[PDB]
Amino acid sequence: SMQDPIADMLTRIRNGQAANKAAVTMPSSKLKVAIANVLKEEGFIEDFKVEGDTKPELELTLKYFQGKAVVESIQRVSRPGLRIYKRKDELPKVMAGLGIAVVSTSKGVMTDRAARQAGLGGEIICYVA
Amino acid sequence: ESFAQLFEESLKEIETRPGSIVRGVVVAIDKDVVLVDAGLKSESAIPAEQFKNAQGELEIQVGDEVDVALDAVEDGFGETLLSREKAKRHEAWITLEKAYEDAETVTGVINGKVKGGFTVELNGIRAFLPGSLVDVRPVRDTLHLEGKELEFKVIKLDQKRNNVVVSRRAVIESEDPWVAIAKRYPEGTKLTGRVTNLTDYGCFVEIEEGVEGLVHVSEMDWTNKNIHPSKVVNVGDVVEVMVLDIDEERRRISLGLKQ
């Protein structure tokens, strides 16, 4: 059964990048939306677009720089089987700071740097590079 | 723009599948291959033997136009099925024209009954007939000057199997294959059938309304085993064959050619 929506998102994105798909669509969720927004802010994607009322569909638009994809790597870290929660000091650095780590915090979902700046940790969703 | 889309549907509108629209201009001749271009993906490897008329020499130079045939695409590279078959549609139209006035008038010269019925030839092709049609009455053209010139007056046609019998004389006078498969049966009714593919044990001449014949390898000639059918007859040619044997059950009519 479908158990982890976010991870499914990330896999879809990965597969689109692999296959040189322009855009990747999937059912929408708020957490998914926020993640997409974070990615866009962090520039791994061009734009995201949710559409629909009863069952809305998130549609991300993937990014390709000099042929190859932008999202070099994208992994979940927290997962239903095994959750990961980090305190602000302990927060990670993806690719020695070049990549990002999406982290959900009390004040919303943000990149690891942003969280560090804020002064708070939380659940580590995914690494992106 | 939609320029191109409109053109695509235009060019759809100005071509059809069969060999109907005389469009291919002969753009290279060499012996033994003619080639055309009828607005298809590729040029046709035409034989010279589709295009010599009734005495054995060529008739069309560069720029000349005959339609070919279609509905089969790319055996690996190329485009067509041959154009004389197109001529068969014109012959069918001429034969149908009879219906209008109940009399199609051509020359028809029938010397001898291949399969009971005299063979009647229209300009290039020669078709085979059922017995009665050669003569309106018991006149029997065997006493007429050999290969005589009258006309063809249609007595009988099979309407799915191209067997057409016509009346040479007497100007004044004017599932489906397998249930009743007893027409060409009795022992030895000879037929005019185009061969389709030679499978190195066979030739597969099969013309008479969705049947299959095999003149396989043993007769074919008067040598038995060293023969290799491709050397000895043809590809795609109408020949002498007769039944010799019918299964109506396991649909194996085993024709012959040594006759």
Partner: protein
Amino acid sequence: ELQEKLIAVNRVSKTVKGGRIFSFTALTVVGDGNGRVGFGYGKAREVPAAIQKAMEKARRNMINVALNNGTLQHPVKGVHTGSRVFMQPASEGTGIIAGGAMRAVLEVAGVHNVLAKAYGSTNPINVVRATIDGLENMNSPEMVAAKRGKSVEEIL
């Protein structure tokens, strides 16, 4: 200007009607002390000829690597067939902490400071290939900025 290191040389056999024909394989690697690196794997009946071939092959099909000053830009993994390799940027003075063929390629590359372990197979040929792969895929800050449509200070 280019420096060249023959990593390994190995005798390989071919059985024939008479007996065993022996030959020699030479695995070399060359580099200019900067980003640029290239390995070559030559073969000949005699050793010196085989190493000569290895040098020739290495000299062509070289590959560039984006070095932050003496070390790498971030931890990087690279694999090839059995040899799976981890290598990690390190502070000036630490030197090349790496084993075997891997070491050699790093030195010619002109990296001076790395912490580096070869997991899995340590078959010199495969492991050097894996190293090269890890070095190639490694991208720089400017490169990622360009990829992502940002400035370097935005990425830090």
